[PDB]
Design a protein around this ligand. Structure first.
Ligand SMILES: *C/C=C(\C)CC/C=C(\C)CCC=C(C)C
Ligand SMILES: O=S(=O)(O)CC(O)CNC1CCCCC1
Ligand SMILES: O=S(=O)(O)C[C@H](O)CNC1CCCCC1
Ligand SMILES: O=S(=O)(O)C[C@H](O)CNC1CCCCC1
Ligand SMILES: [Zn+2]
Lengths: 314, 9, 480
């Protein structure tokens, strides 16, 4: 049985405030007894700006019922700061929420604020947890963006060691080994190998990168992720497509292809590569013809787009 | 028929 | 010939290459679901016994939305997003061509105005319970454009009075790098930028100090794939800005729309350019194969989702326009399958007939307000050829009255406003004019399954009907 807060000794001194959405409001929600009661007292708590333990406990009650209540989360963190609570304890609480909440903006940002304030000298323990967090959902957009922020933030403070980066790349490589179609992992690899300020860019670092990309494509020729990464790579570093063409040509029918079972030809992205190759050689006529084949046969869903590319040649 | 996992806020 | 029907194309699974993964397991499973539903359903383009009729069940969807009464307790998970529940409803009803009576509209207006804080901005609920937030602010302003008017009880009057406060709220949200927090102590990403720019444009509260770095924050969101990530990180003005995640359908919509809104601002070397051709490419690459109903997906190697018909499909004409301008800088068939997309909506995205109504993520998912709104928003973009017409913008410049307008906003910093009245008025004209520069190309209409499937025309970037956008923005720029 639920005990109304009006009958609670700890709250006897608080006069609750009713929700004010006017008369006959639209989209009204049938709140539970618990939820309404808690908000009734929160309205009073926040109105008087009381920073207390009971206020803190109340915020946990509320956010558990509605993990997306940004107002309550904002008030909670101001309580953590004001009461000088153990942010480590709160971090362990967030590990329970991260289990079933999954895709709440408010949970994730709350975790971000915690780690910003705590500002640990070595974020390795948090990095690990994030990795483990990704097992149930390897493509959680919130999580990946958070990992990006964690490494970017703490590297700006100079707390990401070369050993840390190195193990991260190992972990990323393992993610792509388990599912090479994980576009989130590809995106992370781009950060580690290309976009991050401290990325190693040498005339031999490029060698290794092409080797990795090509082998990835040869393992899974119809993987859109690998193809996009390949084009973004050549484009970013202003590399010519022509020299690497021999490794792609076979898919239009440095590591080379084998051919793997269940691999229908031609691969539309390989044709795009070939077409753009012709453009690179100023052979607009030969480019148009492959663009026309994409539009007419090999990628008809984008008939109009490939028709646009074919005209872009003329 | 499960609910869709589309949060935008 | 450039927008082939799904039924006129060979349905074949995504090839495995003999290397199975978790991704491929879900893809195949989803392929079977959509593929079978299409088989059960009659081809919308034909003139079949025992097969389901794919016609747009408009009356079912209207009734799904009627649930203006009360929502089940399980909606508490959106107690902080009530303005979205309002927007999804009143906008869908606008697209479905169903009018609200004046009494019901007044309720909508009154409800939203109770979400308005005197300090500035709308919250996800009553002001005495929730703090202002850029998202509910967008959803509320847009909803007031749809359900409100210019009478003493229309709501527009109240917005006009709140202009200075809303602006001051916007400034408190502003970070130095050009990003915005969605609320006090809130997260930072292009969602906030989008929602803020939309409202600032409509309410005539745009200033130089408001826009500083805002453009750089968005450009830096573009990834190697061509789409845009949620946010960009500034390494300490900043040495360099790096994208923080995958190119995403929603964030790409927010990025394209934000950047587009900025292009009409009379600032020098503003806004920082994006790669229009790469954005277009990523956009068209996200449309599913025939076997998956030709619906849009939001990320590479993930599943198609009805809600992306708007986020991805609705960004197409914005990207297409940016590409057009790109080619004119140096110096036509449709850019995506407008037919297939409609088919996905009619066949796969609609709830099974004779049930609860509403549209959905995909087969196997429950319908909801959100997917109802975004499925129909995308359907609109596909049915109607939308274009930003320079001749129309020029026509708007010619009729613009700079002598009429609401009082200028008071900037936070002394020099935060426009250099002078001339610069400000030329800025007001450009922003207003371009905001009304979207037209439906006559003869460009394509209505799969017959004219009874037709819904109304939504505006790219803003996503409200042109007939709402015009009277509304005209009110705040006093161009009525
Ligand atoms: C399943 C659908 C998802 C996760 C929605 C993703 C799209 C966005 C996030 C875009 C949100 C845009 C605004 C709130 C303006
Ligand atoms: O599917 S719709 O939303 O277009 C409309 C709908 O379902 C109602 N059909 C009735 C029922 C029986 C006799 C007359 C019409
Ligand atoms: O913005 S105003 O000052 O006009 C009104 C005001 O401050 C209301 N604050 C509530 C109180 C408790 C829940 C969160 C918001
Ligand atoms: O496209 S047209 O306007 O030529 C024809 C038209 O709209 C047909 N709609 C049918 C008619 C009867 C019941 C169900 C739907
Ligand atoms: Zn969705």
């Amino acid at each position: 049985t639920y005990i109304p807060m009006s009958q609670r000794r700890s709250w006897a001194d608080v006069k609750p405030i009713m929700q004010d959405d006017g008369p006959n409001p639209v989209v009204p929600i049938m709140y539970s007894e618990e939820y309404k009661d808690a908000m009734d007292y929160f309205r009073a708590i926040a109105a008087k700006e009381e920073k207390s333990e009971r206020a803190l406990e109340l915020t946990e009650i509320i956010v558990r019922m509605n993990p997306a209540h940004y107002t309550v989360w904002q008030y909670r963190f101001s309580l953590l700061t004001s009461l000088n609570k153990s942010l480590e304890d709160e971090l362990r609480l967030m590990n329970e929420f991260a289990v079933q909440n999954l895709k709440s903006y408010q949970v994730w940002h709350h975790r971000l604020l915690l780690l910003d304030r705590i500002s640990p000298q070595d974020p390795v323990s948090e990095i690990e947890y994030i990795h483990g967090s990704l097992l149930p959902d390897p493509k959680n957009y919130h999580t990946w963006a958070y990992l990006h922020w964690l490494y970017s933030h703490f590297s700006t403070l100079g707390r990401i060691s070369e050993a840390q980066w190195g193990s991260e790349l190992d972990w990323c490589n393992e993610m792509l080994r388990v599912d090479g179609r994980n576009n989130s992992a590809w995106g992370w690899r781009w950060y580690l190998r290309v976009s991050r300020p401290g990325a190693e860019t040498s005339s031999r670092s490029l060698q290794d990168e092409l080797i990795y990309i090509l082998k990835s494509i040869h393992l899974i020729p119809h993987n859109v992720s690998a193809w996009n990464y390949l084009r973004g790579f050549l484009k970013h570093f202003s590399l010519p497509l022509v020299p690497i063409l021999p490794a792609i040509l076979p898919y239009t029918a440095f590591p080379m292809p084998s051919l793997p079972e269940d691999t229908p030809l031609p691969v539309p992205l390989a044709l795009e590569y070939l077409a753009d190759s012709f453009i690179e050689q100023n052979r607009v006529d030969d480019a148009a013809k492959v663009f026309e084949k994409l539009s007419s046969e090999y990628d008809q869903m984008r008939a109009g787009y490939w028709e646009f590319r074919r005209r872009e040649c003329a | 028929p499960t609910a869709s996992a589309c949060n935008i806020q | 010939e450039f927008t082939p029907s799904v039924y006129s194309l060979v349905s074949k699974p995504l090839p495995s290459n003999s290397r199975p993964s978790a991704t491929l397991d879900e893809q195949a499973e989803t392929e079977d679901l959509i593929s079978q539903l299409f088989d059960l359903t009659a081809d919308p383009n034909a003139l079949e016994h025992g097969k389901r009729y794919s016609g747009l069940r408009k009356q079912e969807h209207t009734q799904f939305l009627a649930s203006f009464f009360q929502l089940p307790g399980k909606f508490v998970s959106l107690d902080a997003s009530r303005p979205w529940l309002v927007f999804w409803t009143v906008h869908s009803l606008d697209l479905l061509g169903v009018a609200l009576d004046q009494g019901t509209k007044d309720r909508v207006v009154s409800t939203l105005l109770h979400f308005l804080s005197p300090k500035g901005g709308f919250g996800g609920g009553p002001a005495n319970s929730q703090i202002p937030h850029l998202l509910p602010t967008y959803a509320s302003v847009c909803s007031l454009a749809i359900a409100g008017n210019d009478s003493s009880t229309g709501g527009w009057k109240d917005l006009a009075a709140a202009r200075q406060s809303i602006y001051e709220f916007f400034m408190r949200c502003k970070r130095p790098d050009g990003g915005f927090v969605v609320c006090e102590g809130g997260e930072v990403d292009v969602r906030g930028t989008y929602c803020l720019l939309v409202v600032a444009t409509l309410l005539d509260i745009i200033t130089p100090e408001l826009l500083h770095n805002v453009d750089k924050f968005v450009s830096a969101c573009q990834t190697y794939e061509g789409g845009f990530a949620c946010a960009s990180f500034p390494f300490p003005e900043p040495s360099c800005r790096v994208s923080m995640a995958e190119a995403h359908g929603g964030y790409t919509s927010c990025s394209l729309n934000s950047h587009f809104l900025l292009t009409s601002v009379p600032l020098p070397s503003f806004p920082l350019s994006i790669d229009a051709n790469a954005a277009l490419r990523w956009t068209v690459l996200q449309q599913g194969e025939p076997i998956e109903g030709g619906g849009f997906r939001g990320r590479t190697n993930k599943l198609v989702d009805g809600c992306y018909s708007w986020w991805v499909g609705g960004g197409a004409p914005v990207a297409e326009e940016l590409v057009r301008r790109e080619k004119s800088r140096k110096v036509i068939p449709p850019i995506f399958n407008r037919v297939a997309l409609q088919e996905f909506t009619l066949v796969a995205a609609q709830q099974d007939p004779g049930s609860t109504g509403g549209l959905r993520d995909k087969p196997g998912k429950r319908p909801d307000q959100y997917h109802t709104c975004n499925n129909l928003s995308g359907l609109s973009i596909a049915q109607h050829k939308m274009s930003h017409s320079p001749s129309t913008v020029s026509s708007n410049r010619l009729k613009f009255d700079a002598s009429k307008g609401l009082p200028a906003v008071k900037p936070v910093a002394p020099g935060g406003g426009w250099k002078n009245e001339d610069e400000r008025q030329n800025a007001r004209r450009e922003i207003w004019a371009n905001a009304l520069g979207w037209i439906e190309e006559e003869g460009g209409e394509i209505i799969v399954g017959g004219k009874d499937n037709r819904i109304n025309t939504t505006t790219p970037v803003f996503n409200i009907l042109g007939l709402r956008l015009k009277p509304f923005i005209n009110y705040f720029y006093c161009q009525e």
